[PDB]
Design a protein around this ligand. Sequence first.
Ligand SMILES: OC[C@H]1O[C@H](O[C@H]2[C@H](O)[C@@H](O)[C@@H](SC[C@H]3O[C@@H]4O[C@H]5[C@H](O)[C@@H](O)[C@@H](O[C@H]6[C@H](O)[C@@H](O)[C@@H](O[C@H]7[C@H](O)[C@@H](O)[C@@H](O[C@H]8[C@H](O)[C@@H](O)[C@@H](O[C@H]9[C@H](O)[C@@H](O)[C@@H](O[C@H]%10[C@H](O)[C@@H](O)[C@@H](O[C@H]3[C@H](O)[C@H]4O)O[C@@H]%10CO)O[C@@H]9CO)O[C@@H]8CO)O[C@@H]7CO)O[C@@H]6CO)O[C@@H]5CO)O[C@@H]2CO)[C@H](O)[C@@H](O)[C@@H]1O
Ligand code: CA
Ligand code: CA
Ligand code: CL
Length: 870
Amino acid sequence: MPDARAYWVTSDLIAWNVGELEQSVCLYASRAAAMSLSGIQGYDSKVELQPESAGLPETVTQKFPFISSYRAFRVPSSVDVASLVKCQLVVASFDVTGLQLPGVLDDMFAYTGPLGAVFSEDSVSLHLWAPTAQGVSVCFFDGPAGPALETVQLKESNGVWSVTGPREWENRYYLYEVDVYHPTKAQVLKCLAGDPYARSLSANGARTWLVDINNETLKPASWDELADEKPKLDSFSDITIYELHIRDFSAHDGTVDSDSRGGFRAFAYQASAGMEHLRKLSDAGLTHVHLLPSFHFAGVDDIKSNWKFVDECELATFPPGSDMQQAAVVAIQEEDPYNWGYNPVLWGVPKGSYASDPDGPSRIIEYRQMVQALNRIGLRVVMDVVYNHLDSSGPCGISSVLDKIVPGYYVRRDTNGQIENSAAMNNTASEHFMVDRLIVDDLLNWAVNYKVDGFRFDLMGHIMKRTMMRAKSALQSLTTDAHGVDGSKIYLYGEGWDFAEVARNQRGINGSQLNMSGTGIGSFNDRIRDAINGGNPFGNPLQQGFNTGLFLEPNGFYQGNEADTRRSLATYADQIQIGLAGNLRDYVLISHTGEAKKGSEIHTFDGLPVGYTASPIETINYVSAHDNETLFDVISVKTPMILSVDERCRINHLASSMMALSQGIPFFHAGDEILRSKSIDRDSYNSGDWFNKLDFTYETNNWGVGLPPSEKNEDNWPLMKPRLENPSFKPAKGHILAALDSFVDILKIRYSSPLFRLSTANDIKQRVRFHNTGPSLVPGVIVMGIEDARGESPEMAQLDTNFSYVVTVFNVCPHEVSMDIPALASMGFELHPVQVNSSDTLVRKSAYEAATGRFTVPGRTVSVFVEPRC
Ligand SMILES: OC[C@H]1O[C@H](O[C@H]2[C@H](O)[C@@H](O)[C@@H](SC[C@H]3O[C@@H]4O[C@H]5[C@H](O)[C@@H](O)[C@@H](O[C@H]6[C@H](O)[C@@H](O)[C@@H](O[C@H]7[C@H](O)[C@@H](O)[C@@H](O[C@H]8[C@H](O)[C@@H](O)[C@@H](O[C@H]9[C@H](O)[C@@H](O)[C@@H](O[C@H]%10[C@H](O)[C@@H](O)[C@@H](O[C@H]3[C@H](O)[C@H]4O)O[C@@H]%10CO)O[C@@H]9CO)O[C@@H]8CO)O[C@@H]7CO)O[C@@H]6CO)O[C@@H]5CO)O[C@@H]2CO)[C@H](O)[C@@H](O)[C@@H]1O
Ligand SMILES: [Ca+2]
Ligand SMILES: [Ca+2]
Ligand SMILES: [Cl-]
């Protein structure tokens, strides 16, 4: 983008950071974009701006904090602002620079009326917001491939272009022809653009399909009664999440027909191994499946005849630590069917590559059939929404839509006018009114038109808090009577990471972890993640954590002396325990020094509070996700090499059990339960089906299938190779099935007692106690007690009709421990019936001794004890 260091913030105010003396500022305009530097030449009009020593007003400095110190310049009322914003514009001092227009575009043209296509009994109308455009027409087509049918002009009213046609316009395909000034090219360009409000598209979004989303033929059988069939959700506190990629789910599933693998239709195969797997988890108590991006994204061709694949039989013959597998994958990675999909083009349309036919209605109906089928096996559906950036910007290319139409508006820019890229590329600006509008409108589209049950917000910290809250309110007020869905059950969460240009609320109060405290919107708890696994996404891969052998089982990487590692372990245990108690600001823990500390008073990187939430439903507790190494892989990297796979399997279980028995909302990565490996790939977004294999035959976990792709992994290839080559690292089917069995059981334990899912911070503060704390704590053990009403005259409600007390012991030590808790002596504790009947013979040996309150727990085991009310 070229130089644009001034801002047109309101109809009558311009902001520019020039010095006092620099009283001679003028605004130049050229409709045909013909200006040059002399003194400016080739302008239609020149107007002097009167300086404003009142400074920028409250509303401007609140909306754009980062420019709050800029000098304000008054635009004379003689200026025709509507005409000027359609021109090439510069201001000059006596230094020349362009103008960033979003402030004035919102001030004058913020619009709440219909956008996209509106269907009435006798007509179809199209509406497009494009206040800077000099002209807008619509080019129609009869079909996704054929020649032009006709072009119709749209007429502008207050920034919005519209036209109304007959009802027979329905099912045509179309594009907008938009004449608009593009700063990056310094020309008025005729751009061919899709509809931001599209509901369907031809292959690759080349054309927009003028479809009526309410048409009966787009509805699966019994679609309108899906609300009645949706699984009950009594509380957000009952949520558990399973994070799954649509292609991963069925790409390798032989029980699905070959022509129907990798997409929406695969979820209709109820008897498939994959759907039987999800049924098993759902039956054990899992409530939500979070699907990776499933809207129209770039990086996968919708046209299946262009898809390329590796020779799977050849690659199977290569050695487990060879670099040849990744070479073959990388050779086709730009042309294969695979991508996570974090490359947004149009948010409101199902991804064509996941449909049976990317032209016509299959993408709509099949998406609905997917939601319906998941709901029918007891699972609510969460969509991974990516509102923080766009795949592309500018006037050219199939993958640029929003920035084609209103350049420099939907995207966030720096103080020189260059597009911000911290999210990946082409960061959006939800701080702008129509971006905020599009985000909320899209969410309501998915909630109402596809009956989606929740949303995970990618880089929520890059979205304005006001956008998140307005969305939350709109979604949760939807009703079955008015909209066909119970909005009160719709749950929102996201990545509240706080970095780059949105840090320190520089663009407004953003959706960071700290800012979302007290909003009821979940965010990923990175503190528990890193405390359990060790290190961080950017640190040394060998840095150990609570569950990967820090102090207890050192791996040979130097991490201080024995006192240092013991202290680091205890510090991590503090952070874990705050997390296990819902990661609350106000929860009081006896810290490892002996000092009682609130969750907010225990600090992490940059002195920030470990516990930052106001409620447990604000905490998404996780140790694994699609990003970074899988749970199996991180454990395989960090633990001592000499551990057996049997031992590491127990360690995998410990990690997922800490999540499954935590207060707040547990989050599991698809494959946690079956030891899923990516052969240590840290960023597998483009590593294809080969490295992302989800094997529901349970014969393999995909460990030892070659070094992962060099671009993101080569620096760590030396640590990976000997591990991938070592046959003792690889689990067999027996291990995989045992991992699944123990995962199902811990879910069952979570849902066996309301005490694991307390709904408020007050409840957690009153009921949750940790019993192995302080400087003399027993290393490698966490003891978590949860109290219910007991005796006559209780100080709390009775939440659990079966149990009056629950105690969980997480023992990561490679030996049995005996934990004496005198305060829990002389009580009726016994092993949880699920564990009494476990297929794992070791956990059955767990015991309680009444006289001393001793809980005896085997090595590498989580033991749950309950006090029956009988
Ligand atoms: O990318 C453009 C962008 O880069 C910078 O912004 C980064 C920022 O500086 C950084 O802190 C994080 S912020 C998001 C993050 O927040 C928490 O993380 C905290 C850590 O837990 C904590 O330890 C501490 O981190 C420090 C490290 O310990 C320290 O070693 C040092 O890190 C170096 C690193 O050693 C070096 O290699 C390099 O990193 C590059 C990587 O090597 C590349 O792989 C790539 O990174 C990718 C990454 O592979 C992807 O997975 C994806 O990252 C995701 C994570 O997976 C998520 O978990 C999440 O990260 C959170 C943590 O979870 C949370 O605990 O979001 C990430 C972003 O979506 O994408 C990455 C980017 O492509 O590229 C990086 C290049 O940076 O450099 C780093 C230092 O930058 O220093 C850090 C302290 O800074 O504090 C953390 C909190 O700050 O990531 C930002 C995005 O990359 C520029 O500042 C910014 O202006 C620019 O626009
Ligand atoms: Ca269920
Ligand atoms: Ca790919
Ligand atoms: Cl396929």
